[PDB]
Amino acid sequence: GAISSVLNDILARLDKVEAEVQIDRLITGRLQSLQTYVTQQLIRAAEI
Amino acid sequence: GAISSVLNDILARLDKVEAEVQIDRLITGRLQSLQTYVTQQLIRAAEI
Amino acid sequence: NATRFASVYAWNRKRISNCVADYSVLYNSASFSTFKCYGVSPTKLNDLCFTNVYADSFVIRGDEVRQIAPGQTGKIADYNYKLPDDFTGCVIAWNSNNLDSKVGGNYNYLYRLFRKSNLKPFERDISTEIYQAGSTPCNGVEGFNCYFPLQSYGFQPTYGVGYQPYRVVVLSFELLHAPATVCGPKKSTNLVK
Amino acid sequence: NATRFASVYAWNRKRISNCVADYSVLYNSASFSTFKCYGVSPTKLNDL
Incomplete structure (x- = not known):
């Protein structure tokens, strides 16, 4: 739901007080994507 | 991304709606941190 | 309420300390055209103490006050007065046409039109x-594209609001990391155990 | 570098499009007397 998925293309279009709000979205969504992977890996690793 | 991590400091320095937007960040993060702990704990409980 | 205020190229900083700051007498006055806080809200100032108090003071046009908001960009925000992004404090402004504008165009007031880089x-x-x-390289005092780095406001009382001069104060302060030195008008109570 | 400019009673217009506005040759040239832009600072029109 950010304006872009490319971190440098956010920074190359918006000024810092709102480029931070887009970057915070990508940080939240990517951190949620690592947590989904690591949870999947832990549950699998218990199977193995 | 809130102004502070101390909940009573946010409630002292801001009014009913400026404190609310800042507290919702602490609620979001804290909820996600405690969910991460309960996920690690349920997986460790299955090992034990 | 000082007699005269600085050009924004040379904004004056007063350090406020070891004293009681009632803010009701500021915020409840209508005599300020703007009172905008950031890391606090205006009604809450009396419920706090401050480890230092800063009152940066200067004059600017009514139509550039928008750039005083922290983390913005534009000539004022880029070359002559920078707030830090976490700015905790409040900005105050009021019209001053009747004290600080002049029918000649009040060229007592200047701002930095150019600079090497965005200032800290x-x-x-x-x-x-x-x-x-x-x-080009450029020596002495002059040359084509070689600019004297201050430019002046035209301030005349026949110019409209937005053209007119405003006195501005920024109250910058820091909280709960250090000893308090400024505090609100609130009264203590007998410490039960 | 035109042979004949218009006169301000009927000032000319030309539309410039589909092309590169390479102001290095323009702005650095000491052939001019005065240059004033009101929306934007000179150096970054090469980018905007």
């Missing part, structure tokens, strides 16, 4: 040394 938060810079705007 709360950096201040008096330098008159000539700006080399085009790719």
Whole structure:
């Protein structure tokens, strides 16, 4: 739901007080994507 | 991304709606941190 | 309420300390055209103590006050007065046409039109040394594209609001990391155990 | 570098499009007397 998925293309279009709000979205969504992977890996690793 | 991590400091320095937007960040993060702990704990409980 | 205020190229900083700051007498006055806080809200100031108190003070046009908001960009925010992004404090402004505008165009007031690079938060810079705007070297006091780095406001009372001069104060302060030295008008109570 | 400019009673217009506005040759040239832009600072029109 950010304006872009490319971190440098956010920074190359918006000024810092709102480029931070887009970057915070990508940080939240990517951190949620690592947590989904690591949870999947832990549950699998218990199977193995 | 809130102004502070101390909940009573946010409630002292801001009014009913400026404190609310800042507290919702602490609620979001804290909820996600405690969910991460309960996920690690349920997986460790299955090992034990 | 000081007699005269500085040009924004040379904004004056007063350090406020070891004293009681009632803010009701500020915020409840209508005599300020703007009172905008950031890391606090205006009604809450009396419920706090401050480890230092800063009152940066200067004049600017009514139509550039928008750039005083922290983390913005534009000539004022880029070259003559920078707030840090986490700015905790409040900005105050009021019209001053009837004290500080003049029918000649009040050229007592200047701002930095050019500079080498974007200045650090709360950096201040008096330098008159000539700006080399085009790719030429340039010596002495003058040349084509060699600019005297201050430019002046036209302030006349016949000019409209937005053209008119405003006095501005920024109250910058820091909380709960250090000893308090300024505090609200609130009264203590007998400490039960 | 035109042979004949218009006169301000009927000032000319030309539309410039589909092309590169390479102001290095323009702005650095000491052939001019005065240059004033009101929306934007000169150096970054090469980018905007």
